[PDB]
Amino acid sequence: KFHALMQEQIHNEFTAAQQYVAIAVYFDSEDLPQLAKHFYSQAVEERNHAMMLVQHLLDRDLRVEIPGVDTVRNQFDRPREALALALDQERTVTDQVGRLTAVARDEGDFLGEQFMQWFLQEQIEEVALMATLVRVADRAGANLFELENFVAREPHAAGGRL
Amino acid sequence: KFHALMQEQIHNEFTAAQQYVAIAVYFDSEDLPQLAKHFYSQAVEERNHAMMLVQHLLDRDLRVEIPGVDTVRNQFDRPREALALALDQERTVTDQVGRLTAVARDEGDFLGEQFMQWFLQEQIEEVALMATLVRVADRAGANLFELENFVAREPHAAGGRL
Amino acid sequence: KFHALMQEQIHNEFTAAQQYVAIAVYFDSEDLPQLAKHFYSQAVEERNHAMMLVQHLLDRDLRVEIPGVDTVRNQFDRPREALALALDQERTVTDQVGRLTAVARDEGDFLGEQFMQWFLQEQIEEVALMATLVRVADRAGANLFELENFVAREPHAAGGRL
Amino acid sequence: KFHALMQEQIHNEFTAAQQYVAIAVYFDSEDLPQLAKHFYSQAVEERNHAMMLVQHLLDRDLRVEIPGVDTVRNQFDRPREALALALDQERTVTDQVGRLTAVARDEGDFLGEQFMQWFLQEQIEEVALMATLVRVADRAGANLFELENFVAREPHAAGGRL
Amino acid sequence: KFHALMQEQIHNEFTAAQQYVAIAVYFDSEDLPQLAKHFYSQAVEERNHAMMLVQHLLDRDLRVEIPGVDTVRNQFDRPREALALALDQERTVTDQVGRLTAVARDEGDFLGEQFMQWFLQEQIEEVALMATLVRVADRAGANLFELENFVAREPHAAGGRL
Amino acid sequence: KFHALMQEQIHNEFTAAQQYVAIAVYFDSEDLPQLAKHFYSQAVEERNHAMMLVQHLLDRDLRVEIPGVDTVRNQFDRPREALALALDQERTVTDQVGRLTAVARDEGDFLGEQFMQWFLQEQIEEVALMATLVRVADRAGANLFELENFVAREPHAAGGRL
């Protein structure tokens, strides 16, 4: 039952990651190379997370499946609104991850519970950063050059990390 | 109109790549580390291909979209059957790529035509290899150890290559 | 009371470790150098675990005792059966470790609870590996050479690590 | 509400840290360079802990405040009595940290819960050492030279460490 | 009597230093990493000053005490107002230091008088800098990016420096 | 028949080694790091000896078994009494080893006789040292600091040494 929720999380993460590529590609086309570079990177790290969940099920000889990925959002009024979706998403992932921890606790699946511990910390950091990008984006008017300057200056995964 | 077909190919490639992860994870769970390591790699290179198509539309200031990904196959009777799907898939991708070339030629889109040239050559090699893995898999009975030994011994993409 | 269960675990781990030596020496006599080398190593790492528990009680100025060790199994019908005992044992250790975590949680011993967290993760990996050795051993008939090739290719502790 | 208790802990830790400086300065004046050097260091590491708490609230975009610091003890009958206060203090900090863990658990604040995990382990070690200094101090009569010989021989922080 | 005033200065300096941390943490939460980094550093150097005074009393075998620290200001309307408090504070510290020099002169405490000489020079520089940060902050509108770029581009102490 | 006595010696040595861990852990808890460090090491070297015996039977294709280990002593009135047990133990091991040599001589087992030769020499040295630690321990009153200063200043094994 925590197993079923973990599978679903693999799906969520693959989706989340795809959404990042979409966001990265959006920035790339808006000639925001720095933001783009970052979210290209961000998408890869999210893929890593997925593969870490895959790996956990593998290690526990539980059934695992590589899911499809939902359509993701490709059109944005402006860079800030994209950064917003990214923060909003990371906040959601944090919820999902919290819930997994809860379920594992309830089922007294101690292995699952500790395995989620790292993810919780990672989420604190991902949210912290998306939040910062949004604030700084707000501070920079349609002066995206400022946003771009700012970005420029400031468990085992199945397959490897990349 | 070649533009539309190129978008659809971005979707195909992201799908194809996902299917590789599925195959990789399958091998990984069957304790076939060498096969698995390879297809994990294979899936990343396919992702690269997708991103190369993304990059092409970017460079031409044509609309581009990061698609969702179809469900992919996760269960196989045996390693050979998975290798089969991979060959079968790469053959299909070759078709799609040929068809893109044809459409570009027909529309006299000389930029699109030349951009596809590299992909044609890549497909020759990808198919050549999947084909080899299938033959060798056939030669090795249920003696997968032999298959494993064998594997062990023998354009700008948006984001970068991995 | 979690203290009592921790002492007992020190005993279990020393025992587990001894059983590995036994398994290692069995392989060694069967002219399975690779398997043997690994389980000699495996036994040392288990000893390390014991000493990590010793160290925890030391750091908490709680009474600790170096136990004796129960007789362990020395005769096996065949390599596979040995690897089996090893998996079976690591599964048991995981139980013990989970139960410790539970007891500490119940007693609201927050120090004990966190200290166990590492051990949970380690067990996920030890089990994952013994399981893999068993599957591969199954795949290899009485063709132990294949088993051997495969193995060849693929908290603070009191007194330190080894 | 765990947030409130966390703020209060930042205050506690700054206080604790200051008390160490006091202890270090005491030793310094007693011409106990080794003990002094150590507690100067100890005070810095405590400051680090405070800044790690500051950093956690920062990362979670929760309100954080740099508190004042209570008067700390400056006069001691003799080195042993200072070392005593230090052990007694570290034991108290351990309580506070446990309590935080408890509250986070109760409120099901999974992020706070995991973030506290490191601090629990650190406290095991700080207490272990203060306890050792007291025992050895006891063993050394007013023969402080022996105490001195002994000492000589044997999460992100807002700002950095030092 | 200069001794009494020196003790009080130890208190002032510890307080001043704490106020810097507050200012640093404020900037940090406003996503002004450069300003923050600098004032984190600034707070450490102020701590150093305190410890230098501690050391002076130590060297003269005069009674010294590690004081508590007053509450410091944590909320600011905007970065400029914080920089203001910082300048204002350093000017005050300069007064205190001057007054110490005066008292020592009056008491004909030649040792205290010379020991203060270094602190006078340091204050000239600290004030010079806080003043510069304020002017530049004025010049930069709510364009804090400019303030940030600017900062980015442009005796013995008890325990040691840090 | 010398073969039976050799097996029993493997048991003795594993026991002896465990007893050293006990002694090491005792010292560790008494805050005698140097003594502890040494006997941790000493226990490993004893384990080595056991494994050297295992190796001899392995090399001679004689049946060998990894034994359990008897309870060992964990409580001591004071450091000297522990050092005593250690000397007393090594003297006992020397007897056992002599007796093995004798039996091999009687049975005219020339291979066993020579293999024992090294162990005789090693015992001369182990006893020589335990004896020295006892004398020095006697010389040092309850002044253990002196004991500690002193310690600080002054065949194939199945699986390898440590």
JSON list of N, CA, C and O in Angstrom, two decimals, chain D residues 48-66:
[
{"chain": "D", "resi": 48, "resn": "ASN", "atom": "N", "xyz": [27.66, 27.77, 15.40]},
{"chain": "D", "resi": 48, "resn": "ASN", "atom": "CA", "xyz": [27.28, 27.08, 14.18]},
{"chain": "D", "resi": 48, "resn": "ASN", "atom": "C", "xyz": [25.89, 26.44, 14.25]},
{"chain": "D", "resi": 48, "resn": "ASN", "atom": "O", "xyz": [25.07, 26.60, 13.34]},
{"chain": "D", "resi": 49, "resn": "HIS", "atom": "N", "xyz": [25.63, 25.71, 15.33]},
{"chain": "D", "resi": 49, "resn": "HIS", "atom": "CA", "xyz": [24.33, 25.08, 15.52]},
{"chain": "D", "resi": 49, "resn": "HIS", "atom": "C", "xyz": [23.19, 26.12, 15.47]},
{"chain": "D", "resi": 49, "resn": "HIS", "atom": "O", "xyz": [22.16, 25.89, 14.82]},
{"chain": "D", "resi": 50, "resn": "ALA", "atom": "N", "xyz": [23.37, 27.24, 16.16]},
{"chain": "D", "resi": 50, "resn": "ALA", "atom": "CA", "xyz": [22.38, 28.28, 16.14]},
{"chain": "D", "resi": 50, "resn": "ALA", "atom": "C", "xyz": [22.12, 28.69, 14.69]},
{"chain": "D", "resi": 50, "resn": "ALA", "atom": "O", "xyz": [20.98, 28.65, 14.22]},
{"chain": "D", "resi": 51, "resn": "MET", "atom": "N", "xyz": [23.19, 29.05, 13.97]},
{"chain": "D", "resi": 51, "resn": "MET", "atom": "CA", "xyz": [23.08, 29.47, 12.58]},
{"chain": "D", "resi": 51, "resn": "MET", "atom": "C", "xyz": [22.47, 28.43, 11.66]},
{"chain": "D", "resi": 51, "resn": "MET", "atom": "O", "xyz": [21.86, 28.78, 10.66]},
{"chain": "D", "resi": 52, "resn": "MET", "atom": "N", "xyz": [22.63, 27.14, 11.99]},
{"chain": "D", "resi": 52, "resn": "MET", "atom": "CA", "xyz": [21.95, 26.07, 11.25]},
{"chain": "D", "resi": 52, "resn": "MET", "atom": "C", "xyz": [20.44, 26.13, 11.45]},
{"chain": "D", "resi": 52, "resn": "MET", "atom": "O", "xyz": [19.68, 25.87, 10.51]},
{"chain": "D", "resi": 53, "resn": "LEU", "atom": "N", "xyz": [20.01, 26.47, 12.66]},
{"chain": "D", "resi": 53, "resn": "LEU", "atom": "CA", "xyz": [18.59, 26.66, 12.92]},
{"chain": "D", "resi": 53, "resn": "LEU", "atom": "C", "xyz": [18.10, 27.89, 12.17]},
{"chain": "D", "resi": 53, "resn": "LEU", "atom": "O", "xyz": [17.06, 27.85, 11.49]},
{"chain": "D", "resi": 54, "resn": "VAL", "atom": "N", "xyz": [18.84, 28.99, 12.27]},
{"chain": "D", "resi": 54, "resn": "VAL", "atom": "CA", "xyz": [18.50, 30.18, 11.49]},
{"chain": "D", "resi": 54, "resn": "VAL", "atom": "C", "xyz": [18.29, 29.80, 10.03]},
{"chain": "D", "resi": 54, "resn": "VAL", "atom": "O", "xyz": [17.29, 30.17, 9.41]},
{"chain": "D", "resi": 55, "resn": "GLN", "atom": "N", "xyz": [19.24, 29.04, 9.49]},
{"chain": "D", "resi": 55, "resn": "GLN", "atom": "CA", "xyz": [19.20, 28.61, 8.09]},
{"chain": "D", "resi": 55, "resn": "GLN", "atom": "C", "xyz": [17.97, 27.79, 7.73]},
{"chain": "D", "resi": 55, "resn": "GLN", "atom": "O", "xyz": [17.41, 27.94, 6.65]},
{"chain": "D", "resi": 56, "resn": "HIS", "atom": "N", "xyz": [17.56, 26.91, 8.64]},
{"chain": "D", "resi": 56, "resn": "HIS", "atom": "CA", "xyz": [16.36, 26.12, 8.41]},
{"chain": "D", "resi": 56, "resn": "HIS", "atom": "C", "xyz": [15.11, 27.01, 8.23]},
{"chain": "D", "resi": 56, "resn": "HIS", "atom": "O", "xyz": [14.35, 26.84, 7.27]},
{"chain": "D", "resi": 57, "resn": "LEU", "atom": "N", "xyz": [14.89, 27.95, 9.14]},
{"chain": "D", "resi": 57, "resn": "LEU", "atom": "CA", "xyz": [13.75, 28.84, 9.00]},
{"chain": "D", "resi": 57, "resn": "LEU", "atom": "C", "xyz": [13.85, 29.69, 7.74]},
{"chain": "D", "resi": 57, "resn": "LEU", "atom": "O", "xyz": [12.85, 29.91, 7.05]},
{"chain": "D", "resi": 58, "resn": "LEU", "atom": "N", "xyz": [15.05, 30.18, 7.45]},
{"chain": "D", "resi": 58, "resn": "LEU", "atom": "CA", "xyz": [15.31, 30.88, 6.20]},
{"chain": "D", "resi": 58, "resn": "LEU", "atom": "C", "xyz": [14.85, 30.05, 4.99]},
{"chain": "D", "resi": 58, "resn": "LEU", "atom": "O", "xyz": [14.11, 30.54, 4.14]},
{"chain": "D", "resi": 59, "resn": "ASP", "atom": "N", "xyz": [15.28, 28.79, 4.93]},
{"chain": "D", "resi": 59, "resn": "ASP", "atom": "CA", "xyz": [14.97, 27.91, 3.80]},
{"chain": "D", "resi": 59, "resn": "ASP", "atom": "C", "xyz": [13.47, 27.65, 3.69]},
{"chain": "D", "resi": 59, "resn": "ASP", "atom": "O", "xyz": [12.97, 27.33, 2.61]},
{"chain": "D", "resi": 60, "resn": "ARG", "atom": "N", "xyz": [12.76, 27.76, 4.80]},
{"chain": "D", "resi": 60, "resn": "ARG", "atom": "CA", "xyz": [11.34, 27.48, 4.79]},
{"chain": "D", "resi": 60, "resn": "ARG", "atom": "C", "xyz": [10.54, 28.77, 4.77]},
{"chain": "D", "resi": 60, "resn": "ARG", "atom": "O", "xyz": [9.33, 28.77, 4.97]},
{"chain": "D", "resi": 61, "resn": "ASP", "atom": "N", "xyz": [11.23, 29.87, 4.50]},
{"chain": "D", "resi": 61, "resn": "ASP", "atom": "CA", "xyz": [10.57, 31.17, 4.45]},
{"chain": "D", "resi": 61, "resn": "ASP", "atom": "C", "xyz": [9.65, 31.32, 5.64]},
{"chain": "D", "resi": 61, "resn": "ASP", "atom": "O", "xyz": [8.50, 31.71, 5.47]},
{"chain": "D", "resi": 62, "resn": "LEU", "atom": "N", "xyz": [10.16, 30.98, 6.83]},
{"chain": "D", "resi": 62, "resn": "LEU", "atom": "CA", "xyz": [9.47, 31.23, 8.09]},
{"chain": "D", "resi": 62, "resn": "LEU", "atom": "C", "xyz": [10.17, 32.37, 8.78]},
{"chain": "D", "resi": 62, "resn": "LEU", "atom": "O", "xyz": [11.36, 32.54, 8.59]},
{"chain": "D", "resi": 63, "resn": "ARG", "atom": "N", "xyz": [9.43, 33.14, 9.58]},
{"chain": "D", "resi": 63, "resn": "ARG", "atom": "CA", "xyz": [10.01, 34.30, 10.28]},
{"chain": "D", "resi": 63, "resn": "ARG", "atom": "C", "xyz": [11.12, 33.87, 11.23]},
{"chain": "D", "resi": 63, "resn": "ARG", "atom": "O", "xyz": [10.95, 32.94, 12.03]},
{"chain": "D", "resi": 64, "resn": "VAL", "atom": "N", "xyz": [12.28, 34.54, 11.15]},
{"chain": "D", "resi": 64, "resn": "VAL", "atom": "CA", "xyz": [13.37, 34.23, 12.07]},
{"chain": "D", "resi": 64, "resn": "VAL", "atom": "C", "xyz": [13.95, 35.49, 12.69]},
{"chain": "D", "resi": 64, "resn": "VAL", "atom": "O", "xyz": [14.01, 36.54, 12.05]},
{"chain": "D", "resi": 65, "resn": "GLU", "atom": "N", "xyz": [14.38, 35.38, 13.94]},
{"chain": "D", "resi": 65, "resn": "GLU", "atom": "CA", "xyz": [14.92, 36.53, 14.65]},
{"chain": "D", "resi": 65, "resn": "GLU", "atom": "C", "xyz": [16.19, 36.20, 15.40]},
{"chain": "D", "resi": 65, "resn": "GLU", "atom": "O", "xyz": [16.29, 35.16, 16.04]},
{"chain": "D", "resi": 66, "resn": "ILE", "atom": "N", "xyz": [17.16, 37.10, 15.31]},
{"chain": "D", "resi": 66, "resn": "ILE", "atom": "CA", "xyz": [18.39, 36.97, 16.06]},
{"chain": "D", "resi": 66, "resn": "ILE", "atom": "C", "xyz": [18.15, 37.56, 17.45]},
{"chain": "D", "resi": 66, "resn": "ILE", "atom": "O", "xyz": [17.96, 38.78, 17.58]}
]
